[PDB]
Design a protein around this ligand. Sequence first.
Ligand code: YT1
Ligand code: YT1
Ligand code: OLC
Lengths: 165, 165
Amino acid sequence: TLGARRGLEWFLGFYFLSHIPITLLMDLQGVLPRDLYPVELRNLQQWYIEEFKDPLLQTPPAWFKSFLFCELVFQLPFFPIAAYAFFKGGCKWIRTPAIIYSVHTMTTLIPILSTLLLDDFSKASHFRGQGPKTFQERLFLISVYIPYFLIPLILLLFMVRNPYY
Amino acid sequence: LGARRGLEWFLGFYFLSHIPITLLMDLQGVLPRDLYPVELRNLQQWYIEEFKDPLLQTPPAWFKSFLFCELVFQLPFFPIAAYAFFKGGCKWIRTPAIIYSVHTMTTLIPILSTLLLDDFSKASHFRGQGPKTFQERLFLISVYIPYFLIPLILLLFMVRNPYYK
Ligand SMILES: COc1cccc2c1CCC[C@@H]2CCCN1CCN(C2CCCCC2)CC1
Ligand SMILES: COc1cccc2c1CCC[C@@H]2CCCN1CCN(C2CCCCC2)CC1
Ligand SMILES: CCCCCCCC/C=C/CCCCCCCC(=O)OC[C@H](O)CO
């Protein structure tokens, strides 16, 4: 049947494939004009921000907004190329690109996960009551961001040590 | 000499000088300043007052995480990378230097974006600590931009130089 290395490649292929609709229809609504999005998709983002209490994608600060422009200009073009590579197999030319993507993404989420778990989101802060208030509400939000840090770390370890790449 | 060997000399001097820069300056906002002598505390207070640095003294959550990354991840790599480019022809530094380059570049994209585009008034969360004029934003970007360009050169150097593949 399928192997261990090939199984991770299929799992990584769906990660890069599913990241395309997640970036376009969700994350980029904080940097791109609202008029590029239909009303049905603009309310879907608000369902997330209200339920998960996300203070970043709601109104992005300057540091978070710079990571979103990286996702549009650098990460988004790489997603289809990486998906095709790990679905086909034997594409060694992706080793250095996948390392660059992994290290970059992981470095974007260390300040994100640190802010969501340690920063203050009360009315006295600049977030002005928009954000997780309880420890359970912080992990409920960290749960959505943690797959985008763990999966790239898996890709970094895979690329550095795999002799077939 | 030559451009390649000269760049390795320049890179070695970058990683060697980054050791006193990190220990004696940048880590004063992550480590307790009781461990620093009065003179080293006063030199940082001079830089914060003269250059109007809004991040180094009282770092936000996102800026603190990078300073911890600079301590746990970057500082141990500085002597190894200095030896690799001073000696020359250390092909084992390629992937480790790529990881440092993409990490440090991703660290400063939000910093440069914040210094140039964010609001540093008395009503902002920085409480008038930052720079107001465009002139001092360049005075502050000038001390942060070499840590984006030199890692950018390193990334392009390791990706294409056949003497490290
Ligand atoms: C039926 O379930 C759903 C339906 C609709 C949406 C969602 C779910 C399930 C859970 C919540 C999601 C909404 C996704 C929002 N997140 C996208 C990734 N983003 C990161 C990417 C990396 C760079 C930093 C930002 C963080 C935000
Ligand atoms: C006699 O003049 C000097 C003497 C000593 C030092 C300096 C000067 C004058 C020029 C300024 C320097 C001090 C620079 C301080 N910066 C170092 C890099 N650091 C990191 C933060 C994390 C991301 C990477 C960059 C931010 C702070
Ligand atoms: C006293 C002040 C001291 C500091 C003063 C400021 C120094 C600015 C230096 C910039 C280096 C630029 C190097 C550019 C090298 C070529 C880039 C290139 O060709 O890039 C191709 C591209 O990356 C393919 O994707």
